[PDB]
């Protein structure tokens, strides 16, 4: 939760969630502004699930 995927390779480096989730979204071929324009909707769906 705190540092993403960088704590398995070497040392731990911190990062905020909206940026970490933007990276994850970019990982599957969707441009990263889509997350920034839909943050509240995405959070609501996550909590409901």
């Amino acid at each position: 939760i705190t540092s993403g995927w960088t704590f398995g390779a070497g040392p731990a480096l911190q990062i905020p969630f909206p940026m970490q989730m933007a990276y994850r979204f970019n990982g599957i071929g969707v441009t990263q502004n889509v997350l920034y324009e839909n943050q509240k909707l995405i959070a609501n769906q996550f909590n409901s699930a």
Partner: peptide
């Protein structure tokens, strides 16, 4: 630039105006 959260102000350079100044 009104919908994003935590967006800051700055200046963005342009690589054509210095050339077109002359």
């Amino acid at each position: 630039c009104d919908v994003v959260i935590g967006i800051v102000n700055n200046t963005v350079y342009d690589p054509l105006q210095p050339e077109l100044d002359s």
